[PDB]
């Protein structure tokens, strides 16, 4: 009519929440009886508030409220029907399986990935998913997980964070992981979580709620990780790698020109032959191996994203169920698309769903 | 008509001579392998130690005469079609000095910039720097001295403030004094991000990550902190020029706004009233953006954020000389931005005229 597809939309299955509920170290879910909803505590930047609340009963509630929407497949479908979304490509949210002990991670990752497949089977044609990987485990266990996700119905990709195997995404030990995913034609969805070292937010950090780590930390983290991939030659070494970047590439469309200029003016790089004239620029990679979600909350940002990658490589997302009304968050981004490319346009239909349908083969199984 | 460059730096010969004698970053050091090395950044410390210890690569960047020579500045202007420069000390300014030595050198160096501008009246104005490692009293004394300095049109400062960043309440009297004196504040990065974010392969990428990412991100965090702390509301006459088209601010402005209005704690504790001045409003009323963005993509975003009347052309001379071209010829790191202006707003348009210099002339009262 045409189809609306949401590619940035999360869940924590009940089995995953139940795990978080039993933890005493981040990530965790903890009930504070002065609030009905349990608190979801995921982030390094939240540790200070957690500790303050664990000592002083007068301190503010740490983390964010855990609504039922995080774990309810039924509320996901309700959200879709209420918002005119025909298909969601759901993904486990941060920090995935990153925090698990090496020995246990593969069994848990594999169980949870299968639960996602089973969730999609309940609503055939309306749900597909990005699987996540046991990246704290040895690479051979990670490969075994990739081999399993390749066989799972409704799986169309992999969601992962910026830590890789623990040394980031420019780690050559991670290359076989990108390679095995790309060879299986799975889209890689890169998503933030670790943000930036907390000291950058300053000694008044606790006064600003979650604004700085979420509004700045997250997209900057994404940008740094993809820039490191680019500099390390990951996009040339895995030529068929295709990546979807969270939050319109973080800040990448805005900084792409600056990155190119710093590269071609880097004396050391140039003098040591690391800037050959046939180098694939960041602009070329943005056109050939990167897709951007449209979760940017303004036509200013969206226009830059579109100018960087083309309208055929932008994909609508909501980031449901984060940022509930205190869903404006879904609608603002839909409006941003229209302002950017005009209502009823082929570009609008592309961004709102047809790109995702094409790239992620949102029919088969 | 007039081309004005508001993002263009010098280290006076006095400043370099000090750097040549220094034991720790920042410093200038000669190496037998080649031109002195300029070593400024924390990201350069590992390379410095390894070079002090044979065939390790040259640390820092080549210290050409372009950093120190007024004649070279004018020549660069005359080979790049620039009529007027508003020059500034380069990072890290007076930041690294002991609190005791900083006032004396800060003021001597500000006086030298005024002297330099007097050599080329009408073509040179400057942003002054402040002894922010010293007590506030000395910072205020320096402000009072720069207020009376001929050809001074503003202050350049980093993100560290007095040592606790720009949301530091003790810094509010400094912003008030500068804003009352009608001095534009040119916010410029230096400290980047903590080096661990660049990872253990950091060394293989030359300076690309600290400069291409760390700098504009540092700027963005500093201004966001100022904004969140109410600085712009508390000092309503404060005007700020942001380096590198605001770092990443025009791209993240929407995200920042969304995160604020959806922040449960902030909203429920009354920190997000309905009449709050948004970042979009501050971007149109108290913020100017330079056009040092190297692409019409980023430039168009900056223009949509602050308006074409609040964008100002700059080059960042002399930091990115051509590597395989004549440094005495036109610089591509300056031609790129000029072209970005053309692509974004059209050659010969009044918007081009505004961005290329007329905005700077108006806002900074140049003649
Ligand atoms: O903005 C987002 O995408 C998110 C923000 N904060 C989270 O904890 N998870 C997310 O997915
Ligand atoms: O990009 C820049 O503006 C700069 C980059 N690197 C420096 O050392 N100083 C600068 O001013
Ligand atoms: Zn998300
Ligand atoms: Zn500069």
């Amino acid at each position: 009519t045409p189809v609306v597809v949401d590619i940035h939309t999360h869940m924590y299955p009940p089995s995953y929440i139940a795990m978080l509920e039993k933890r005493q170290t981040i990530p965790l879910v903890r009930t504070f009886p002065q609030a009905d909803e349990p608190r979801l505590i995921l982030l390094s930047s939240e540790l200070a508030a957690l500790d303050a609340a664990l000592a002083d009963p007068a301190a503010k509630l740490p983390g964010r409220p855990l609504s039922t929407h995080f774990a309810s497949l039924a509320q996901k479908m309700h959200f879709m029907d209420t918002n005119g979304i025909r298909v969601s490509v759901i993904s486990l949210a941060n920090p995935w399986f990153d925090f698990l002990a090496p020995d246990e991670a593969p069994g848990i990752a594999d169980a949870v990935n299968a639960e996602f497949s089973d969730m999609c089977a309940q609503h055939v044609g309306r749900l597909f998913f990005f699987a996540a990987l046991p990246l704290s485990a040895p690479v051979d266990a990670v490969k075994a997980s990739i081999e399993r996700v390749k066989n799972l119905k409704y799986c169309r990709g992999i969601i992962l964070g910026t830590s890789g195997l623990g040394k980031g995404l420019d780690d050559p030990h991670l290359l076989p992981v990108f390679e095995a995913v790309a060879d299986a034609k799975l889209l890689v969805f890169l998503h933030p979580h670790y943000g930036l070292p907390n000291e950058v937010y300053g000694p008044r950090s606790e006064e600003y709620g979650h604004v700085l780590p979420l509004a700045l930390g997250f997209p900057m983290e994404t940008t740094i990780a993809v820039a490191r991939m680019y500099m390390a030659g990951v996009f040339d070494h895995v030529r068929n790698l295709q990546m979807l970047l969270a939050h319109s590439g973080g800040t990448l469309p805005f900084l792409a020109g600056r990155i190119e200029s710093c590269i071609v003016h880097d004396g050391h790089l140039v003098k040591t032959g690391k800037v050959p004239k046939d180098r694939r620029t960041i602009w070329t990679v943005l056109k050939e191996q990167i897709y951007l979600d449209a979760v940017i909350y303004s036509e200013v940002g969206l226009q830059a994203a579109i100018a960087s990658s083309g309208a055929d490589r932008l994909m609508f997302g909501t980031n449901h169920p984060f940022f509930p009304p205190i869903w404006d968050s879904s609608r603002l981004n839909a409006q941003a698309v229209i302002k950017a490319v005009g209502e009823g346009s082929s570009d609008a239909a592309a961004v709102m769903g047809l790109n995702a349908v094409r790239v992620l083969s949102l029919k088969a199984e």
Side-chain angles (χ1 to χ4, degrees), chain A:
Chain A
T1 190
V3 176
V4 177
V5 182
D6 186 353
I7 46 61
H8 190 148
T9 177
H10 303 303
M11 287 191 71
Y12 296 116
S15 68
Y16 191 94
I17 294 304
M19 181 177 318
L20 295 192
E21 277 166 348
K22 297 154 185 170
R23 290 176 55 85
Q24 309 278 56
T25 168
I26 289 170
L28 62 99
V29 165
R30 167 82 145 82
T31 297
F32 288 79
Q34 62 265 48
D36 295 340
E37 296 176 303
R39 310 297 298 188
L40 177 63
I41 312 172
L42 302 172
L43 311 183
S44 161
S45 57
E46 292 171 327
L47 181 271
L50 174 51
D51 287 349
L54 254 33
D56 178 20
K60 64 177 178 172
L61 300 169
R64 290 164 290 183
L66 178 78
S67 71
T68 58
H69 302 89
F70 284 98
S72 177
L73 182 58
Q75 287 185 317
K76 181 69 69 179
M77 298 310 303
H78 176 93
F79 170 73
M80 289 166 61
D81 289 347
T82 296
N83 289 264
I85 298 163
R86 180 70 191 169
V87 184
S88 293
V89 192
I90 56 176
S91 52
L92 178 65
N94 50 305
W96 311 284
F97 311 117
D98 291 2
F99 67 93
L100 297 171
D103 285 331
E104 75 192 343
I108 294 169
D110 296 344
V112 171
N113 287 333
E115 292 189 337
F116 271 81
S117 185
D118 195 66
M119 286 199 292
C120 296
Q122 307 301 294
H123 307 284
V124 167
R126 296 200 64 193
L127 296 179
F128 300 81
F129 77 105
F130 296 96
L133 298 178
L135 291 170
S136 74
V139 182
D140 291 288
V142 177
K143 285 181 172 183
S145 292
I146 292 167
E147 287 313 304
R148 290 178 176 106
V149 317
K150 282 160 69 173
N151 288 350
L152 290 172
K153 278 136 98 177
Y154 311 111
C155 186
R156 290 304 192 268
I158 292 294
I159 183 164
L160 39 59
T162 59
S163 66
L165 308 169
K167 301 187 199 309
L169 301 186
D170 55 0
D171 180 6
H173 295 150
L174 191 63
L175 290 172
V177 175
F178 282 132
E179 210 177 347
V181 171
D183 285 358
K185 281 171 179 308
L186 296 164
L187 184 63
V188 177
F189 184 18
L190 179 59
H191 192 288
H193 168 74
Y194 296 90
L196 297 171
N198 292 311
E199 64 260 36
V200 306
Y201 305 121
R204 305 189 62 185
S205 55
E206 301 304 312
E207 288 175 59
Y208 306 139
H210 284 72
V211 176
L212 299 191
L214 297 185
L216 313 184
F218 273 23
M220 291 175 184
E221 171 196 359
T222 301
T223 310
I224 293 159
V226 68
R228 289 168 52 177
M229 286 178 68
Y230 175 77
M231 293 301 293
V234 178
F235 291 100
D236 289 0
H237 294 158
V238 192
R239 275 310 298 257
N240 58 343
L241 178 62
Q242 295 288 318
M243 287 238 314
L244 171 67
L245 303 182
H247 313 125
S248 296
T251 61
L252 180 56
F254 196 78
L255 295 183
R258 182 177 185 79
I259 293 170
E260 279 294 312
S261 187
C262 291
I263 287 169
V264 303
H265 295 100
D266 200 286
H268 176 62
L269 294 186
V270 171
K271 285 150 186 160
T272 57
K274 302 215 254 186
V275 195
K277 290 191 290 181
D278 46 273
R279 175 182 61 95
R280 297 176 68 237
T281 67
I282 188 82
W283 296 118
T284 294
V285 175
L286 279 162
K287 289 280 195 190
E288 295 180 1
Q289 294 173 269
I290 289 174
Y291 294 94
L292 304 177
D293 77 20
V295 187
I296 189 62
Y297 307 98
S298 78
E299 64 281 6
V300 174
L302 181 58
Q303 220 302 279
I306 287 170
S308 289
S309 284
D312 60 317
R313 309 187 66 89
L314 262 291
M315 297 180 188
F316 174 77
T318 61
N319 193 42
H320 179 271
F322 286 97
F323 304 108
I326 300 305
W327 294 59
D328 39 21
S329 281
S330 165
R331 205 168 93 91
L332 207 183
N333 284 312
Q335 302 259 32
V337 178
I338 295 171
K339 287 182 193 187
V341 299
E343 214 179 17
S345 67
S346 292
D347 284 359
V351 180
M352 294 307 301
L354 298 195
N355 288 337
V357 172
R358 179 190 73 248
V359 171
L360 298 182
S361 310
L362 298 182
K363 290 188 172 180
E365 255 153 337

mmCIF file of all heavy atoms in Angstrom, chain A residues 58 96 137 154 212-213 221 253 264 277 307 311 320 330:
data_model
loop_
_atom_site.group_PDB
_atom_site.id
_atom_site.type_symbol
_atom_site.label_atom_id
_atom_site.label_comp_id
_atom_site.label_asym_id
_atom_site.label_seq_id
_atom_site.Cartn_x
_atom_site.Cartn_y
_atom_site.Cartn_z
ATOM 1 N N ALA A 58 17.502 7.689 49.433
ATOM 2 C CA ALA A 58 17.025 8.990 48.952
ATOM 3 C C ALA A 58 17.471 9.320 47.519
ATOM 4 O O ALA A 58 16.999 10.300 46.936
ATOM 5 C CB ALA A 58 17.460 10.098 49.906
ATOM 6 N N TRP A 96 23.393 -7.466 24.022
ATOM 7 C CA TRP A 96 23.376 -8.766 23.357
ATOM 8 C C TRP A 96 23.971 -9.824 24.275
ATOM 9 O O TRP A 96 23.559 -9.937 25.434
ATOM 10 C CB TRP A 96 24.098 -8.650 22.007
ATOM 11 C CG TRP A 96 23.566 -7.455 21.280
ATOM 12 C CD1 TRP A 96 22.370 -7.360 20.639
ATOM 13 C CD2 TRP A 96 24.166 -6.152 21.208
ATOM 14 N NE1 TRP A 96 22.197 -6.087 20.141
ATOM 15 C CE2 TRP A 96 23.287 -5.328 20.474
ATOM 16 C CE3 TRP A 96 25.367 -5.608 21.680
ATOM 17 C CZ2 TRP A 96 23.570 -3.988 20.198
ATOM 18 C CZ3 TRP A 96 25.649 -4.270 21.408
ATOM 19 C CH2 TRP A 96 24.754 -3.479 20.670
ATOM 20 N N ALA A 137 33.130 -15.540 23.282
ATOM 21 C CA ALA A 137 33.652 -16.900 23.132
ATOM 22 C C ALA A 137 34.762 -16.951 22.075
ATOM 23 O O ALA A 137 34.936 -15.993 21.320
ATOM 24 C CB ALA A 137 32.517 -17.858 22.765
ATOM 25 N N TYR A 154 13.524 -17.095 8.997
ATOM 26 C CA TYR A 154 13.234 -15.680 9.287
ATOM 27 C C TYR A 154 14.444 -14.838 9.685
ATOM 28 O O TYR A 154 14.313 -13.628 9.880
ATOM 29 C CB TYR A 154 12.115 -15.551 10.330
ATOM 30 C CG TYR A 154 10.928 -16.408 9.981
ATOM 31 C CD1 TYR A 154 10.602 -17.525 10.740
ATOM 32 C CD2 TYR A 154 10.151 -16.121 8.865
ATOM 33 C CE1 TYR A 154 9.526 -18.327 10.405
ATOM 34 C CE2 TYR A 154 9.070 -16.908 8.528
ATOM 35 C CZ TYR A 154 8.763 -18.012 9.298
ATOM 36 O OH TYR A 154 7.687 -18.800 8.961
ATOM 37 N N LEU A 212 23.431 12.865 27.473
ATOM 38 C CA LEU A 212 24.746 12.869 26.835
ATOM 39 C C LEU A 212 25.192 11.489 26.334
ATOM 40 O O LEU A 212 25.631 11.375 25.190
ATOM 41 C CB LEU A 212 25.802 13.530 27.726
ATOM 42 C CG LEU A 212 25.510 15.002 28.067
ATOM 43 C CD1 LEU A 212 26.715 15.656 28.727
ATOM 44 C CD2 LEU A 212 25.091 15.802 26.837
ATOM 45 N N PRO A 213 25.070 10.437 27.164
ATOM 46 C CA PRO A 213 25.483 9.138 26.618
ATOM 47 C C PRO A 213 24.584 8.640 25.481
ATOM 48 O O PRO A 213 25.088 8.016 24.556
ATOM 49 C CB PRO A 213 25.401 8.195 27.827
ATOM 50 C CG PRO A 213 25.473 9.097 29.025
ATOM 51 C CD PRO A 213 24.782 10.360 28.609
ATOM 52 N N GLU A 221 30.218 6.606 19.265
ATOM 53 C CA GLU A 221 30.758 5.248 19.345
ATOM 54 C C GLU A 221 30.649 4.528 17.998
ATOM 55 O O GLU A 221 31.624 3.941 17.518
ATOM 56 C CB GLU A 221 30.014 4.446 20.418
ATOM 57 C CG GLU A 221 30.346 2.953 20.437
ATOM 58 C CD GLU A 221 29.332 2.147 21.221
ATOM 59 O OE1 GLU A 221 28.380 2.754 21.770
ATOM 60 O OE2 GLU A 221 29.482 0.906 21.303
ATOM 61 N N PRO A 253 27.789 10.622 8.063
ATOM 62 C CA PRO A 253 27.500 11.518 6.935
ATOM 63 C C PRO A 253 28.017 12.937 7.154
ATOM 64 O O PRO A 253 28.432 13.586 6.197
ATOM 65 C CB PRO A 253 25.970 11.536 6.879
ATOM 66 C CG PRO A 253 25.558 10.222 7.461
ATOM 67 C CD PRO A 253 26.566 9.958 8.556
ATOM 68 N N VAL A 264 43.896 12.224 3.154
ATOM 69 C CA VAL A 264 44.740 12.632 2.043
ATOM 70 C C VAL A 264 45.790 13.656 2.465
ATOM 71 O O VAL A 264 46.719 13.899 1.726
ATOM 72 C CB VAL A 264 43.945 13.151 0.826
ATOM 73 C CG1 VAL A 264 42.956 12.111 0.325
ATOM 74 C CG2 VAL A 264 43.247 14.458 1.133
ATOM 75 N N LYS A 277 46.223 6.248 -5.149
ATOM 76 C CA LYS A 277 45.243 7.032 -5.908
ATOM 77 C C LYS A 277 43.955 6.258 -6.221
ATOM 78 O O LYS A 277 42.895 6.860 -6.395
ATOM 79 C CB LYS A 277 45.862 7.581 -7.200
ATOM 80 C CG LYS A 277 46.898 8.677 -6.967
ATOM 81 C CD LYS A 277 47.289 9.391 -8.257
ATOM 82 C CE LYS A 277 48.116 8.505 -9.179
ATOM 83 N NZ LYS A 277 48.520 9.220 -10.425
ATOM 84 N N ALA A 307 22.058 12.314 1.201
ATOM 85 C CA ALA A 307 23.082 12.886 0.322
ATOM 86 C C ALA A 307 24.349 12.027 0.318
ATOM 87 O O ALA A 307 25.078 11.991 -0.673
ATOM 88 C CB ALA A 307 23.408 14.319 0.740
ATOM 89 N N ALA A 311 19.075 7.576 -1.578
ATOM 90 C CA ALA A 311 17.757 7.231 -1.049
ATOM 91 C C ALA A 311 17.502 5.724 -1.066
ATOM 92 O O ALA A 311 16.702 5.216 -0.278
ATOM 93 C CB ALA A 311 16.671 7.961 -1.842
ATOM 94 N N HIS A 320 11.776 1.204 18.669
ATOM 95 C CA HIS A 320 10.821 0.691 19.640
ATOM 96 C C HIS A 320 11.496 -0.446 20.422
ATOM 97 O O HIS A 320 12.229 -1.244 19.836
ATOM 98 C CB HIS A 320 9.581 0.186 18.907
ATOM 99 C CG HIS A 320 8.524 -0.384 19.800
ATOM 100 N ND1 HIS A 320 8.493 -1.713 20.157
ATOM 101 C CD2 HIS A 320 7.440 0.183 20.379
ATOM 102 C CE1 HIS A 320 7.442 -1.942 20.920
ATOM 103 N NE2 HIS A 320 6.787 -0.806 21.075
ATOM 104 N N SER A 330 8.398 7.287 16.789
ATOM 105 C CA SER A 330 8.180 6.653 15.489
ATOM 106 C C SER A 330 7.670 7.662 14.460
ATOM 107 O O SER A 330 8.098 7.659 13.304
ATOM 108 C CB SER A 330 7.178 5.502 15.618
ATOM 109 O OG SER A 330 6.689 5.101 14.349
#
